[PDB]
Amino acid sequence: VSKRDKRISLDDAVGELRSGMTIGIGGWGSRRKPMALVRALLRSDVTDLTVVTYGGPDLGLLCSAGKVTKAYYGFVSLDSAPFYDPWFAKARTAGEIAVREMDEGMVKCGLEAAAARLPFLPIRAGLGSDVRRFWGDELRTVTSPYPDASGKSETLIAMPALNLDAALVHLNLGDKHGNAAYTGVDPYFDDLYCAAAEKRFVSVERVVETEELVKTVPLQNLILNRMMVDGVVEAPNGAHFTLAGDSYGRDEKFQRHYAESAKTPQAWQQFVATYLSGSEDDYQAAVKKFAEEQA
Amino acid sequence: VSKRDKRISLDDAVGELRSGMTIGIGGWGSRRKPMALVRALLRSDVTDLTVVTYGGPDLGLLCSAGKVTKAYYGFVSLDSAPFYDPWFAKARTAGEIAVREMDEGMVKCGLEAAAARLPFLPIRAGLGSDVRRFWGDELRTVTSPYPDASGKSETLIAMPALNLDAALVHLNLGDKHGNAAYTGVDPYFDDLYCAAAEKRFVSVERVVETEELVKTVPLQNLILNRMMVDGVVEAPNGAHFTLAGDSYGRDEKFQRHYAESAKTPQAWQQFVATYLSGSEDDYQAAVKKFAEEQA
Amino acid sequence: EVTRAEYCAIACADIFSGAGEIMASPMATLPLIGARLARLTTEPDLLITDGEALIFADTPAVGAKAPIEGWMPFRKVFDVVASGRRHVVMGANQIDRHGNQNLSAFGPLQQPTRQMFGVRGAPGNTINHPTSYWVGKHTSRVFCDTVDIVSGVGYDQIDPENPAYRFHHLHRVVSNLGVFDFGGPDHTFRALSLHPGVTADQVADNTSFEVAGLADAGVTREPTDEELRLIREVLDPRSLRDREVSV
Amino acid sequence: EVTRAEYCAIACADIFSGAGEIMASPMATLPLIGARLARLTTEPDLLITDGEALIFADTPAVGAKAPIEGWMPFRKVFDVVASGRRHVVMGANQIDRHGNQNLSAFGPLQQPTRQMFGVRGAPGNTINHPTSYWVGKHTSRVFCDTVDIVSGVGYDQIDPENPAYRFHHLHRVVSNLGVFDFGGPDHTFRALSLHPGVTADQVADNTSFEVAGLADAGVTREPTDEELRLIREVLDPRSLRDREVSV
């Protein structure tokens, strides 16, 4: 008959998530984050999350809503001034989240282990650093069964698999079955997030038929196949205010406004009232109005 | 001033190799093998080699000249009838080579370990199979420091790094500095062979200036950068008689003639006299003549 | 009237019953027809490739191209293998009573009497995901007491204390004589059905070991009218299937 | 007449002297000018990127595009890190006497008093390949006795019995006051040169610990005429370098 139609709404997708899940979030810093999916999380009652991410304003917004219990990350950055995300910083200085901070290469390594259903992969990164102190006994070493030529055996970090209950990623183009592509210079790690996860949700700028997808991009850009996706969300401008490859750049003015609004109770209630108290369409209309007013 | 000019001849490149080396050969089966570089090896006195390969007629020709002492491979195949390479088969049935046969995924794994300068990577493939008996104590296991949820710890194959003294690969386009690209549907593993090796030689169908290279192929096809290559050889039709992506397909008629000629002393002396007793240009002229005669 | 090869085709389709959204990787013509037949009837979410590097959107005839839906180069196949989301149907020079399989070589490991492919992907396939086998000429030389080289892992290799073995699963063996699995006592080779016209004595005379349940095995089901149409008109109009199925 | 920032620029170029055919990864404006200056003078085989995902063929001015020669997405950067074929120049909130470095946060690990980036790639950088540091305002708050969080690995963390540590190498620290390394006794912070106009007392008053060889350190070399031309006319005509170099 027919392959499964995986098209769902933003609120449908978050409706499949549960409090207490370990969720990986794709993109990188302020780059192609599934921000519409994150805003849908904020509207929901899903909380007590363990988040695995190369962190940016996705983690900031989740922290603004108290939705993060534990975070696994290589960094958190807005990629532009003021660089440090102010909501992540507040959660940290308040001790509201338990962190398993790690080297950026360890995130990739851990996702790769989960993708291959392995319990660990060895890695040098982490040795001799306070990554050991962030993790304590959750991060162990592994000794090579093969000594080096000199007769000494290497002891490496055993990076444990970063198994995910769910993954949220945003891509530029996809079909209704989960085939999806990036456009632009970097896939980041969204394929690894999907491969490491049980439930996989991809938002895309535009849903097209399969044949249009494969004629629009090179083979190498088709980074998700149907085995890697459980739900597809059509979300134009769904990475705003992060950049999104060839679709659009970062909304630098609006990101600055987000960061400044976090500074006081007063400024944040107004940001929430204007941008985060309605639907994705309401958000998109308000963001467009902001850009016109600030020209 | 200027970046290093790495252009060298076929015989120059083999002039950098030494008997006893461990050499990885790129491509896959009868697919984009550096056959011109292999023929240059045959003309040389370099022998006693340890070869790491997804084997095809490259390994067959080396075995026809007694140049292989030890072979690490996931398979050997001509990819067309009669499928089994007859020179590899003769070396095997005569016990002329020591083999470390392994699962195809273990080759990739071992090259990845060498590329990352790790002594091993864990892998499931190999467990419970006679891969253990091919390797004996050269292949050991490694136990996870993290038990699974049930309390049981996984014991996996510790695939040792496949460190190479040299790598020989063939690609479709490159510049004089070692930037190089494949054209067609599959890069195979040529980037991993280069990353696993100390001395790296790439033959290419055509050497172009850097700007022409990067305007001809998508970003994702630029699989070798300058840190991955020590010598560049311009060798048009240099993968013959294997296929080479978009440049050409397999010369099926000539491969069949190679395989049939291996059957008797008599047939092989004639094959050697016609195709392997002169230069690459002599070979290419003889191959063209064969195709015209056999139309 | 249904030919022996047509029964083999639907038996190969049935290999994938309930497979869901996984990569079907048949390595011979009859399993290929079977996988594509399943994809056109009851398993539309199967992923299939052109055998080189392209994932097909539509289901083409044997040897034909079709519009594509994704990229699957060899390096990414090994990612799929390790993910478990695959069911391969391999051939076999030898299969023993517990499912050990050989496609590597005959004779001693370091000096064989006959060379074939080497182990290929058989070790990684059998330890990571469902694996089935196709045998076009069922004989006692294929179905032997002991394989020379274990390239495909059988049930008597499994260490139940080590969870690294937990994904091993040999689903079916389909031959020109019938449909088999390893559901006999102690995971032994067991007859599920015999193709019409095949007798128990024919199977017994062409298998080196005893086949569990052979005396009680029923006959392979009839293809549906739709299945016959798809085999004869859409997938294999030149009857390439006949070339692979002995007697 | 040569400005303080111009001395810092050539000192940052000298970081890469003898580097060969490796990836130069400067993480601030002055090291960026330095790396590109080296590439245009004595280290043409350096690889450099646009800071996002493109490897440059030619050497462009700060903030400019140039023709490209390859692809370097973030996932492939981690392959380069693990390969060792790189020299990164990072910034630092804190550096101690043995080279431990912090860009993560101040205060306790699980409840800091100030949050910065987290450890980023600093652990993997310092354990895999040459690492150098740039400090635009040399102070005792940066050069402290103990860093709060070790993101970059210093020399007193090394286990000489474990070859996993054998690639660690901290090459230079360049500041607005001079050029330093960790070649003092017990791998301690050591003065190699002071920029013209900088006194030993100025360095000592702005470093929490004793600086080895400070009394005998000479003055940073003069830039060549070619280097001044490249800095002022080609690489940084808008003098963005001045914005980063304090006093």
Ligand SMILES: C[C@@H]1CCC(O)=C(C(=O)SCCNC(=O)CCNC(=O)[C@H](O)C(C)(C)COP(=O)(O)OP(=O)(O)OC[C@H]2O[C@@H](n3cnc4c(N)ncnc43)[C@H](O)[C@@H]2OP(=O)(O)O)[C@@]12CCC(=O)O2
């Ligand atoms: C990239 C991925 C990685 C993962 C993956 O999954 C992949 C694989 O690839 S995974 C590999 C899958 N591949 C298979 O499944 C191939 C299985 N093989 C076949 O299918 C064969 O075709 C065959 C079995 C049907 C027939 O083979 P055969 O011809 O050798 O045997 P047979 O005809 O029975 O004659 C036997 C002859 O030996 C004689 N003899 C018998 N005893 C002996 C003895 N003691 N000594 C000497 N001779 C003997 C007998 O007298 C006959 O001699 P003779 O005839 O008298 O001369 C992928 C996918 C795509 C890719 O690229 O990798």
Ligand SMILES: C[C@@H]1CCC(O)=C(C(=O)SCCNC(=O)CCNC(=O)[C@H](O)C(C)(C)COP(=O)(O)OP(=O)(O)OC[C@H]2O[C@@H](n3cnc4c(N)ncnc43)[C@H](O)[C@@H]2OP(=O)(O)O)[C@@]12CCC(=O)O2
């Ligand atoms: C993908 C790859 C992976 C591998 C790789 O290699 C990558 C990396 O990325 S690897 C990361 C490299 N990245 C860096 O190297 C960044 C280093 N950082 C800087 O360069 C900063 O810019 C800075 C250090 C110059 C200034 O930072 P800063 O502003 O935070 O500090 P500073 O100004 O001194 O003020 C300090 C303030 O704290 C106050 N204070 C001091 N004590 C305390 C205390 N106890 N408690 C509370 N406050 C305090 C003080 O009063 C000041 O408060 P205040 O001012 O009074 O309010 C890649 C490449 C591309 C990519 O994407 O990844």
